[PDB]
Design an enzyme around this catalytic site. Structure first.
Site, PDB file in Angstrom:
ATOM      1  N   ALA A  33      -0.968  -5.911   8.679  1.00  0.00           N
ATOM      2  CA  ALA A  33      -0.299  -5.000   7.748  1.00  0.00           C
ATOM      3  C   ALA A  33       1.203  -5.157   7.644  1.00  0.00           C
ATOM      4  CB  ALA A  33      -0.565  -3.541   8.175  1.00  0.00           C
ATOM      5  N   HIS A  73     -18.104 -36.314  21.229  1.00  0.00           N
ATOM      6  CA  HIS A  73     -19.309 -36.336  20.387  1.00  0.00           C
ATOM      7  C   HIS A  73     -19.155 -37.544  19.453  1.00  0.00           C
ATOM      8  CE1 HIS A  73     -22.288 -35.037  17.467  1.00  0.00           C
ATOM      9  NE2 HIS A  73     -22.600 -34.006  18.235  1.00  0.00           N
ATOM     10  N   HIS A  75       0.775  -1.221   0.000  1.00  0.00           N
ATOM     11  CA  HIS A  75       0.000   0.000   0.000  1.00  0.00           C
ATOM     12  C   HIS A  75       0.820   1.292   0.000  1.00  0.00           C
ATOM     13  CE1 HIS A  75      -3.365  -2.731   1.209  1.00  0.00           C
ATOM     14  NE2 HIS A  75      -4.126  -1.801   0.658  1.00  0.00           N
ATOM     15  N   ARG A  86     -24.304 -40.039  24.528  1.00  0.00           N
ATOM     16  CA  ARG A  86     -23.055 -39.942  23.760  1.00  0.00           C
ATOM     17  C   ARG A  86     -21.938 -40.875  24.189  1.00  0.00           C
ATOM     18  NH1 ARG A  86     -23.486 -33.305  22.753  1.00  0.00           N
ATOM     19  NH2 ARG A  86     -24.990 -33.557  21.027  1.00  0.00           N
TER      20      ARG A  86
HETATM   21  C1  HEM Z   1       5.212   3.904   6.259  1.00  0.00           C
HETATM   22  C2  HEM Z   1       3.904   3.893   6.649  1.00  0.00           C
HETATM   23  C3  HEM Z   1       3.563   3.402   8.074  1.00  0.00           C
HETATM   24  C4  HEM Z   1       4.155   3.528   9.256  1.00  0.00           C
HETATM   25  C5  HEM Z   1       5.410   4.347   9.642  1.00  0.00           C
HETATM   26  C6  HEM Z   1       3.438   2.691  10.207  1.00  0.00           C
HETATM   27  C7  HEM Z   1       3.720   2.494  11.541  1.00  0.00           C
HETATM   28  C8  HEM Z   1       3.188   1.500  12.350  1.00  0.00           C
HETATM   29  C9  HEM Z   1       3.647   1.140  13.673  1.00  0.00           C
HETATM   30  C10 HEM Z   1       4.852   1.851  14.358  1.00  0.00           C
HETATM   31  C11 HEM Z   1       2.872   0.158  14.139  1.00  0.00           C
HETATM   32  C12 HEM Z   1       2.965  -0.534  15.522  1.00  0.00           C
HETATM   33  C13 HEM Z   1       2.471   0.338  16.686  1.00  0.00           C
HETATM   34  C14 HEM Z   1       2.460  -0.221  18.080  1.00  0.00           C
HETATM   35  O1  HEM Z   1       2.960  -1.344  18.263  1.00  0.00           O
HETATM   36  O2  HEM Z   1       1.949   0.491  18.989  1.00  0.00           O
HETATM   37  C15 HEM Z   1       1.900  -0.143  13.108  1.00  0.00           C
HETATM   38  C16 HEM Z   1       0.895  -1.113  13.155  1.00  0.00           C
HETATM   39  C17 HEM Z   1      -0.121  -1.263  12.239  1.00  0.00           C
HETATM   40  N1  HEM Z   1      -0.256  -0.576  11.054  1.00  0.00           N
HETATM   41 FE1  HEM Z   1       1.105   0.727  10.283  1.00  0.00          FE
HETATM   42  N2  HEM Z   1       2.393   2.095   9.541  1.00  0.00           N
HETATM   43  C18 HEM Z   1       2.420   2.504   8.238  1.00  0.00           C
HETATM   44  C19 HEM Z   1       1.551   2.161   7.221  1.00  0.00           C
HETATM   45  C20 HEM Z   1       0.423   1.391   7.388  1.00  0.00           C
HETATM   46  C21 HEM Z   1      -0.472   0.993   6.331  1.00  0.00           C
HETATM   47  C22 HEM Z   1      -0.319   1.396   4.847  1.00  0.00           C
HETATM   48  C23 HEM Z   1      -1.420   0.224   6.883  1.00  0.00           C
HETATM   49  C24 HEM Z   1      -2.585  -0.546   6.240  1.00  0.00           C
HETATM   50  C25 HEM Z   1      -2.658  -0.968   4.970  1.00  0.00           C
HETATM   51  C26 HEM Z   1      -1.131   0.115   8.299  1.00  0.00           C
HETATM   52  C27 HEM Z   1      -1.899  -0.589   9.222  1.00  0.00           C
HETATM   53  C28 HEM Z   1      -1.415  -0.994  10.447  1.00  0.00           C
HETATM   54  C29 HEM Z   1      -2.059  -1.973  11.307  1.00  0.00           C
HETATM   55  C30 HEM Z   1      -3.394  -2.678  10.958  1.00  0.00           C
HETATM   56  C31 HEM Z   1      -1.297  -2.117  12.390  1.00  0.00           C
HETATM   57  C32 HEM Z   1      -1.472  -3.098  13.582  1.00  0.00           C
HETATM   58  C33 HEM Z   1      -0.513  -4.331  13.434  1.00  0.00           C
HETATM   59  C34 HEM Z   1      -0.403  -4.952  12.056  1.00  0.00           C
HETATM   60  O3  HEM Z   1      -1.448  -5.342  11.456  1.00  0.00           O
HETATM   61  O4  HEM Z   1       0.742  -5.126  11.550  1.00  0.00           O
HETATM   62  N3  HEM Z   1       0.024   0.831   8.602  1.00  0.00           N
HETATM   63  N4  HEM Z   1       2.117   0.688  12.012  1.00  0.00           N
HETATM   64  C1  HEM Z   2      -5.629  -2.703   6.804  1.00  0.00           C
HETATM   65  C2  HEM Z   2      -6.354  -1.978   5.876  1.00  0.00           C
HETATM   66  C3  HEM Z   2      -6.587  -2.639   4.510  1.00  0.00           C
HETATM   67  C4  HEM Z   2      -6.709  -3.899   4.126  1.00  0.00           C
HETATM   68  C5  HEM Z   2      -6.833  -5.185   4.985  1.00  0.00           C
HETATM   69  C6  HEM Z   2      -6.682  -3.928   2.677  1.00  0.00           C
HETATM   70  C7  HEM Z   2      -6.747  -5.034   1.851  1.00  0.00           C
HETATM   71  C8  HEM Z   2      -6.115  -5.127   0.620  1.00  0.00           C
HETATM   72  C9  HEM Z   2      -5.611  -6.294  -0.068  1.00  0.00           C
HETATM   73  C10 HEM Z   2      -5.656  -7.728   0.519  1.00  0.00           C
HETATM   74  C11 HEM Z   2      -5.123  -5.907  -1.250  1.00  0.00           C
HETATM   75  C12 HEM Z   2      -4.428  -6.768  -2.335  1.00  0.00           C
HETATM   76  C13 HEM Z   2      -2.893  -6.720  -2.288  1.00  0.00           C
HETATM   77  C14 HEM Z   2      -2.095  -7.447  -3.329  1.00  0.00           C
HETATM   78  O1  HEM Z   2      -2.648  -7.641  -4.448  1.00  0.00           O
HETATM   79  O2  HEM Z   2      -0.913  -7.811  -3.060  1.00  0.00           O
HETATM   80  C15 HEM Z   2      -5.310  -4.480  -1.361  1.00  0.00           C
HETATM   81  C16 HEM Z   2      -4.953  -3.649  -2.423  1.00  0.00           C
HETATM   82  C17 HEM Z   2      -5.378  -2.342  -2.589  1.00  0.00           C
HETATM   83  N1  HEM Z   2      -5.843  -1.542  -1.566  1.00  0.00           N
HETATM   84 FE1  HEM Z   2      -6.166  -2.102   0.340  1.00  0.00          FE
HETATM   85  N2  HEM Z   2      -6.566  -2.630   2.235  1.00  0.00           N
HETATM   86  C18 HEM Z   2      -6.515  -1.794   3.308  1.00  0.00           C
HETATM   87  C19 HEM Z   2      -6.416  -0.404   3.303  1.00  0.00           C
HETATM   88  C20 HEM Z   2      -6.575   0.341   2.131  1.00  0.00           C
HETATM   89  C21 HEM Z   2      -6.765   1.774   2.034  1.00  0.00           C
HETATM   90  C22 HEM Z   2      -6.870   2.690   3.267  1.00  0.00           C
HETATM   91  C23 HEM Z   2      -6.795   2.093   0.739  1.00  0.00           C
HETATM   92  C24 HEM Z   2      -6.909   3.462   0.024  1.00  0.00           C
HETATM   93  C25 HEM Z   2      -6.510   4.620   0.590  1.00  0.00           C
HETATM   94  C26 HEM Z   2      -6.654   0.873  -0.020  1.00  0.00           C
HETATM   95  C27 HEM Z   2      -6.659   0.764  -1.405  1.00  0.00           C
HETATM   96  C28 HEM Z   2      -6.177  -0.314  -2.101  1.00  0.00           C
HETATM   97  C29 HEM Z   2      -5.898  -0.355  -3.525  1.00  0.00           C
HETATM   98  C30 HEM Z   2      -6.144   0.854  -4.459  1.00  0.00           C
HETATM   99  C31 HEM Z   2      -5.417  -1.568  -3.813  1.00  0.00           C
HETATM  100  C32 HEM Z   2      -4.996  -2.133  -5.191  1.00  0.00           C
HETATM  101  C33 HEM Z   2      -6.113  -2.889  -5.943  1.00  0.00           C
HETATM  102  C34 HEM Z   2      -7.310  -2.024  -6.253  1.00  0.00           C
HETATM  103  O3  HEM Z   2      -7.137  -1.079  -7.072  1.00  0.00           O
HETATM  104  O4  HEM Z   2      -8.378  -2.296  -5.660  1.00  0.00           O
HETATM  105  N3  HEM Z   2      -6.493  -0.199   0.860  1.00  0.00           N
HETATM  106  N4  HEM Z   2      -5.894  -4.008  -0.193  1.00  0.00           N
HETATM  107  O1  LIG Z   3     -25.873 -30.413  17.502  1.00  0.00           O
HETATM  108  C1  LIG Z   3     -25.139 -31.255  18.210  1.00  0.00           C
HETATM  109  O2  LIG Z   3     -24.946 -32.409  17.897  1.00  0.00           O
HETATM  110  C2  LIG Z   3     -24.544 -30.732  19.475  1.00  0.00           C
HETATM  111  C3  LIG Z   3     -25.397 -30.617  20.542  1.00  0.00           C
HETATM  112  C4  LIG Z   3     -24.789 -30.395  21.868  1.00  0.00           C
HETATM  113  O3  LIG Z   3     -23.469 -30.468  22.037  1.00  0.00           O
HETATM  114  O4  LIG Z   3     -25.486 -30.156  22.849  1.00  0.00           O
END
Ligand code: HEM
Ligand code: HEM
Ligand SMILES: O=C(O)/C=C/C(=O)O
Ligand SMILES: Cc1cc2nc3c(=O)[nH]c(=O)nc-3n(C[C@H](O)[C@H](O)[C@@H](O)COP(=O)(O)OP(=O)(O)OC[C@H]3O[C@@H](n4cnc5c(N)ncnc54)[C@H](O)[C@@H]3O)c2cc1C
Ligand code: HEM
Ligand code: HEM
Ligand code: NA
Length: 568
Positions: free
Chosen positions: A74, A365, A8, A402
């Site tokens: 992520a 079961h 992303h 059972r």
């Molecule tokens: C360079 C861009 C980004 C930076 C610097 C960044 C930074 C971080 C950091 C420092 C954490 C861990 C925080 C903690 O442990 O308290 C985190 C977790 C997370 N970030 Fe990012 N982030 C970035 C981009 C993104 C993007 C693009 C997404 C989603 C597509 C995202 C979704 C998440 C999520 C869902 C978590 C929770 C753990 C995980 O799923 O890996 N972040 N991020």
């Molecule tokens: C944790 C947050 C999100 C999840 C779980 C998610 C889920 C995904 C997944 C599974 C893919 C496919 C990646 C691949 O082909 O390798 C994808 C692609 C993509 N995501 Fe996300 N996404 C997140 C956040 C976002 C956000 C915030 C944006 C826009 C700002 C975004 C826009 C897109 C776009 C544009 C693509 C490329 C394919 C398309 O055009 O639909 N996503 N995302």
């Molecule tokens: O639908 C079943 O066989 C499960 C019932 C139960 O564990 O009570």
């Protein structure tokens, strides 16, 4: 790219998913999942783009609103949650193989430094009651305490709600209901009590079984008032009459009940926190509850200050190492349970002083699918199917308890047997169409063809069903004494499901009284601490009857929430 965030950020800024300062919103990742949905659509909208004929990662039987981060992480590779019970052909970007390896409560004693720092800090929240577990007992307790005037926080260690309760199929037992009367069934709480004690080999605590039978109708009424459909009433093993209630047409009771409870909690604005595990009940200088230390997966350790804690963490049937130390005959068997049902809640209760009882009584079961590795409801047998061995013969009363039905199947050639039924049985229970969709119910237009397909003696099978139908016509099974013979197997096509026993329920656990209060080994109450549902012991004795656990989790969960609110 090596991970989803790396993909992303080629074209997006960090703040596309994160808050302004970058901190994670909370352990449920509410803000972050809201951003995924802003660009991709809701889970149902994503599902339109990932359909397969018989399965879909984004449209399953799980109730509630399943968060995208349950499966898509992520900054590291992540696992598909469905891989814990199934092996569908999926190609999720950035996936890794399913593996569950959660630290025990004892191993978490290694976090001495972080835990002491959290306990030295202010409580993050100050409320009246904390409920641990989002299964049927936990949601029931959270709703009833809230309706009684208390402020509640409900926590769940897994990424998704519902525990094992969301998987329930056969029904919820109750007597004498308006629903039974509408279907011309005659029953009584006294008869449900008598069936229950006999089925448990008289090991059950009679005071807790009296609560179970006497409150059963009220619990069916309470769920129905909240919107549930419990109008279809069928038979399960060891029951004198039909009393297992479930939705119209024979659909699964579990996912429905959990969805109703979740909608009712959202309506009341109850604070529900996912990926948050209860670790240690905190007690004051006089031995009464003062709060609970928890571990959030994303935000770390913190504590909540409260007058009461209700443990509603379920059983331990997924943990085969613990099961085998208590009942070695079940060592190495497969389980019907969700991946977190390992008993950590029992550890928390013992650390707080609670005593356990009946731990040695564990249920297999009788009918897990050999091909799919998932439970096949006992309602298939209750609505009319028979069991046959590889020689094509019947060998057991299919609606016995059972313990006896599992032993019978294990004694047959190959340690497995086959459920056999027709289209009349299939149309009476809509849950059977889910087994056909999973691919574990082969069919043919004759029993000779079906026996050849599956490795069952075909001529013997044909003769077995003819004789059984004759027994159904005369009203008495002179061969195995089955007491209820509801349908002849003679309409349309025939189906076979290969089945074998699997570990399913743990009837022992924390010792509670009739007000759901937890007690120590001296039988003294621990003030402020409650237990409800499969985490408790004394309700089902040596063998639980099918349908009695959904009844138990609603009745005891509801009672525990009302008692905890009054305690305050
Ligand atoms: C360079 C861009 C980004 C930076 C610097 C960044 C930074 C971080 C950091 C420092 C954490 C861990 C925080 C903690 O442990 O308290 C985190 C977790 C997370 N970030 Fe990012 N982030 C970035 C981009 C993104 C993007 C693009 C997404 C989603 C597509 C995202 C979704 C998440 C999520 C869902 C978590 C929770 C753990 C995980 O799923 O890996 N972040 N991020
Ligand atoms: C944790 C947050 C999100 C999840 C779980 C998610 C889920 C995904 C997944 C599974 C893919 C496919 C990646 C691949 O082909 O390798 C994808 C692609 C993509 N995501 Fe996300 N996404 C997140 C956040 C976002 C956000 C915030 C944006 C826009 C700002 C975004 C826009 C897109 C776009 C544009 C693509 C490329 C394919 C398309 O055009 O639909 N996503 N995302
Ligand atoms: O639908 C079943 O066989 C499960 C019932 C139960 O564990 O009570
Ligand atoms: C496949 C299947 C089908 C079944 N069918 C039926 C049926 O038809 N009729 C019937 O009578 N019963 C049925 N049962 C039994 C019934 O579903 C169980 O008894 C379940 O309803 C017990 O509910 P519970 O609320 O006590 O626990 P659960 O529903 O298991 O929920 C407990 C929750 O606590 C969470 N948790 C555990 N430890 C912690 C912790 N430390 N911190 C935070 N959260 C934690 C767990 O992850 C889980 O989500 C079935 C069971 C299974 C597995
Ligand atoms: C709204 C929430 C979610 C979003 C936005 C999201 C996003 C996506 C996207 C964009 C794809 C790629 C689709 C394509 O190829 O066009 C995908 C695939 C996939 N996701 Fe999700 N996802 C979500 C929740 C989940 C959950 C909860 C799970 C697991 C239970 C999951 C498991 C998968 C799997 C297994 C695939 C590959 C599907 C296949 O091979 O058929 N996702 N997801
Ligand atoms: C999001 C994750 C999952 C998906 C997409 C999925 C998909 C399916 C599918 C396609 C079926 C066949 C019937 C139907 O079409 O609904 C099925 C049946 C079943 N699944 Fe799952 N599954 C998931 C997770 C799980 C888990 C983790 C378990 C066990 C803890 C489980 C237990 C069962 C059982 C017991 C059945 C038999 C039919 C029934 O009881 O309705 N599933 N599932
Ligand atoms: Na138990």
């Amino acid at each position: 790219a090596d991970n989803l965030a790396e993909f992303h950020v080629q074209n997006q800024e960090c703040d596309s998913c994160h808050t302004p300062d970058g901190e994670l919103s909370n352990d449920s990742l509410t803000y972050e999942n809201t951003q995924c949905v802003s660009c991709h659509g809701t889970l149902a909208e994503v599902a339109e783009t990932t359909k397969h004929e018989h399965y879909n990662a984004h449209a399953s039987h799980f109730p509630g609103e399943v968060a995208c981060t349950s499966c898509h992480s992520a900054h590291e590779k992540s696992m598909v949650y469905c891989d814990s019970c199934h092996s569908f052909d999926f190609n999720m970007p950035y996936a890794k193989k399913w593996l569950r390896d959660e630290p025990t409560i004892a191993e978490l004693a290694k976090d001495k430094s972080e835990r002491q720092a959290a306990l030295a800090s202010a409580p993050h929240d100050t409320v009246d009651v904390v409920v641990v577990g989002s299964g049927g007992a936990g949601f029931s307790a959270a709703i009833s305490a809230t309706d009684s005037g208390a402020k509640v926080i409900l926590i769940e260690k897994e990424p998704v709600i519902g525990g094992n309760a969301k998987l329930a199929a056969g029904g919820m037992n109750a007597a004498w209901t308006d629903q039974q009367k509408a279907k011309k069934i005659t029953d009584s709480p006294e008869l449900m009590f008598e069936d229950t004690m006999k089925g448990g080999q008289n090991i059950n605590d009679p005071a807790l079984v009296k609560v179970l039978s006497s409150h059963s109708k009220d619990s069916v009424d309470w769920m129905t008032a909240m919107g549930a459909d419990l109008t279809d009433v069928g038979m399960m093993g060891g029951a004198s009459v039909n009393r297992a209630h479930r939705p119209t047409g024979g659909a699964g009771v579990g996912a429905h009940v959990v969805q109703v409870l979740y909608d009712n909690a959202v309506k009341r604005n109850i604070d529900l926190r996912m990926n948050t595990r209860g670790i240690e009940v905190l007690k004051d200088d006089k031995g009464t509850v003062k709060g609970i230390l928890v571990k959030g997966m994303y935000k770390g350790y913190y504590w909540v200050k409260a007058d009461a804690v209700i443990l509603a963490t379920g059983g331990f049937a997924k943990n085969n190492e613990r099961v085998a130390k208590l009942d070695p005959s079940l060592k190495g068997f497969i389980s019907t349970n969700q991946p977190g049902a390992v008993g950590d809640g029992l550890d928390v209760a013992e650390n707080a002083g609670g005593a356990l009882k009946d731990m040695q009584y564990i249920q297999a079961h009788p009918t897990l699918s050999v091909k799919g590795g998932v439970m096949v409801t006992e309602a298939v047998r209750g609505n009319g199917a028979i069991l046959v061995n590889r020689e094509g013969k019947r060998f057991v009363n299919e609606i016995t308890t059972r313990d006896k039905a599992s032993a019978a199947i294990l004694a047959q050639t190959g340690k497995s047997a086959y459920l056999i039924f027709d289209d009349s049985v299939r149309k009476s229970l809509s849950k059977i169409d889910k087994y056909i969709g999973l691919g574990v119910a082969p069919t043919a237009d004759s029993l000779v063809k079906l026996g050849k397909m599956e490795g069952i003696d075909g001529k013997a099978l044909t003769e077995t069903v003819a004789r059984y139908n004759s027994l159904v016509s005369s009203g008495k099974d002179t061969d195995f004494e089955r007491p209820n013979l509801p349908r002849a197997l003679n309409e349309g096509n025939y189906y076979a499901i290969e089945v074998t026993p699997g570990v399913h329920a743990t009837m022992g656990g924390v010792m509670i009284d009739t007000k759901a209060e937890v007690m120590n080994a001296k039988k003294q109450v621990i003030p402020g601490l409650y237990g409800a549902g499969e985490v408790t012991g004394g309700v089902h004795g040596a063998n639980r009857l099918g349908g009695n656990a959904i009844s138990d989790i609603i009745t005891f969960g509801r009672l525990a929430g009302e008692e905890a609110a009054k305690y305050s």
